[PDB]
Design a protein around this ligand. Structure first.
Ligand SMILES: C[S@@+](CC[C@H](N)C(=O)[O-])C[C@H]1O[C@@H](n2cnc3c(N)ncnc32)[C@H](O)[C@@H]1O
Ligand SMILES: C[S@@+](CC[C@H](N)C(=O)[O-])C[C@H]1O[C@@H](n2cnc3c(N)ncnc32)[C@H](O)[C@@H]1O
Ligand SMILES: COc1ccc2c(c1)[C@]13CCCC[C@@H]1[C@H](C2)N(C)CC3
Ligand SMILES: COc1ccc2c(c1)[C@]13CCCC[C@@H]1[C@H](C2)N(C)CC3
Lengths: 338, 338
């Protein structure tokens, strides 16, 4: 029907989960139709056009930590996790994911480590705890996040953690690091070529860079509506600020760094992640509503924020589970400096 | 049946074209089964293993030119050509291919141009004729090829052509070039990382490198038998000396050069190329046998050489036409120096 109509029913909670899932799945299906070309010749033409376009491109309210704790796993990881079993808990999946990054980024005790867009600092705290001679720096644009990480470090008796409060695109420093990690942050970068260039200036010849990003296995796209029938994309990200690179897109951004290894993690891991958050939010729904009320001012504003987050999870499930995780998934790459 | 048995019937010309095509198609089908993995995770693991393996790797009889002229097109191009129409002739398809390379490599009058593994020099002669202020150098490991090119240049009143006689892997020079072209030569390179490094030392900051190579669109493989049922691979290349890179494989070889653009050409163009050579050889069969007899010594040795070349064409047809050209095809990349 009308977008305004669907949006209305959604906010009133009049769309059941089955219908909601069905509608979002169909939106993603149309994206697949948009992205897949009939020949590899056409596929590469499409993909290179996107990559060329990238090379031309040059807040106030934050959720309380108590709410984040009620919706996300123990370390409030806000990125795809890794689920060995169907019964793996979100807390276990956070730890597994942290361990996977440490292996693939070849973290060793004694290294200086920078985590770019470190969020609530789960990975920073993991590395700091596991490798006592490492010196781990998180970089975040959120004062609330910085404060949370430093508190957790204090509680965990960690003395090897610091946090830089900065917009990474504006941050200037002569400091270099043995390891730079970027976990699901590059999706938010307006200018990737300049981003990778900046990162290279923070590396020495001995450094490694590890990037993890949501991807599609074949093509790239901005997270935005194709047509007027897509109410979902703009509801979730009202800004044109998220890019879903193809699994191979970063191979074309080796001006300043050199690839050493490349992996993908099947989308069912991400699907199980957002499912876990959705289920946990649902379980703690009453508590969540109570926590949010002070800072939001009305029970209607609370309902709005919850609907947004819950829909993000329901939609993410359809996206990443599509074709048993073989459409949208997570890409990982390891680089050295050129 | 037995490989020795099939080889026996083949040499006696007792295998009809239909059976021959069917047998070779089945061999290529098994390669597809070998190369395609069930998940992108597994596909990338497979592909990166191949790319890592590459990074660890560190004659007497030539066909008379008269024979080559009887089998190949006018400029004796020995690489995939480009066929606009079903009725495009091989001579037209050679020229079209030459033009495509000139466009994609951004050839401009006045440039110094190096063609690595230039063969019988069709592209060298094309650029020299079209761009009178260019200075075009072909590099070949064949004295016969060098002699052929220089004769043709003399006949065509070209004064802007030279030929280096060298094994490119051994060639040392301080000379740089505005444009370096590599047309279906990298498939023969034992050590690609060192090859690309060497090429970079022959470039300035203003240079471009253009590489064209046979590929598969998804995976890489050596041109060799998977199993004991494959009589074809070792008959065509009795040496383990040809590598079929995936369409994206060279993206992982940007230590010394930086990608600017990337294309593929659908495999039907290659299929139509080998078909044209096969048909022309068939037409000039009597003449070919006469030409070859002096230098081969026996009518049996002649038959052997012809069977080899003809089978190469029949097999190439099945390979490149597989799934309407959407399996094996031609990859092209444009690079600048790092
Ligand atoms: C999807 S979250 C991932 C967070 C964390 N790496 C994790 O795995 O939980 C991406 C993070 O990048 C941060 N971010 C976005 N743009 C940024 C910028 N310009 N400078 C610094 N951080 C930024 C966001 O605030 C967010 O915390
Ligand atoms: C498939 S042919 C392509 C020839 C030509 N570029 C064309 O398009 O017709 C590849 C060429 O590379 C040459 N070649 C192979 N190894 C070489 C080496 N080490 N040095 C120089 N040329 C080499 C072969 O002799 C052959 O002429
Ligand atoms: C369900 O799949 C998705 C889809 C989009 C997004 C995510 C996950 C993230 C995890 C949760 C917080 C927001 C994140 C953001 C957008 N970035 C780009 C990646 C991880
Ligand atoms: C029919 O498809 C093929 C398959 C293999 C090969 C070819 C074409 C070439 C053209 C003809 C001369 C030999 C060439 C050699 C091997 N190189 C690697 C590429 C081009």
């Amino acid at each position: 029907e009308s977008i305004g109509e669907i949006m209305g029913k959604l906010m009133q909670g009049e769309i059941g989960d089955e219908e909601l899932s069905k509608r979002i799945k169909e939106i993603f299906g149309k994206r697949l139709q948009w992205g897949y070309k009939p020949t590899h010749q056409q596929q590469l033409a499409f993909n290179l056009d996107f990559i060329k376009s990238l090379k031309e491109m040059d807040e106030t309210y934050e959720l309380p930590s108590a709410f984040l704790e009620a919706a996300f796993g123990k370390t409030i990881k806000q990125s795809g996790c890794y689920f060995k079993d169907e019964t793996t808990t979100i807390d276990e999946a956070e730890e597994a994911s942290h361990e996977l990054y440490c292996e693939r980024a070849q973290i060793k005790d004694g290294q200086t480590v920078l985590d770019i867009g470190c969020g609530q600092g789960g990975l920073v705290l993991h590395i700091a705890q596991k490798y006592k001679n490492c010196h781990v720096t998180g970089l975040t644009n959120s004062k609330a996040q910085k404060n949370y990480i430093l508190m957790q470090a204090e509680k965990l008796q960690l003395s090897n953690v610091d946090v830089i409060l900065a917009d990474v695109t504006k941050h200037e420093s002569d400091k270099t690091y043995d390891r730079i990690l970027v976990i699901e942050t590059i999706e938010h970068m307006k200018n990737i070529q300049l981003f990778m260039k900046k990162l290279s200036t923070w590396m020495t010849e001995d450094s490694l860079l590890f990037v993890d990003h949501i991807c599609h296995k074949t093509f790239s796209h901005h997270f935005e509506a194709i047509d007027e029938d897509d109410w979902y994309s703009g509801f979730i990200f009202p800004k044109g600020c998220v890019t879903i690179l193809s699994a191979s897109a970063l191979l074309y951004f080796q001006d300043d760094v050199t690839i050493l290894d490349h992996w993908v993690v099947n989308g069912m891991h991400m699907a199980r992640s957002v499912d876990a958050w959705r289920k946990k939010l649902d379980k703690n729904m009453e508590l969540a509503r109570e926590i949010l009320l002070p800072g939001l001012g009305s029970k209607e504003a609370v309902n709005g924020v919850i609907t947004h987050i819950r829909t993000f999870c329901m939609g993410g499930y359809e996206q990443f589970s599509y074709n048993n995780g073989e459409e949208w998934m997570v890409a990982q790459m390891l680089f050295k400096k050129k």
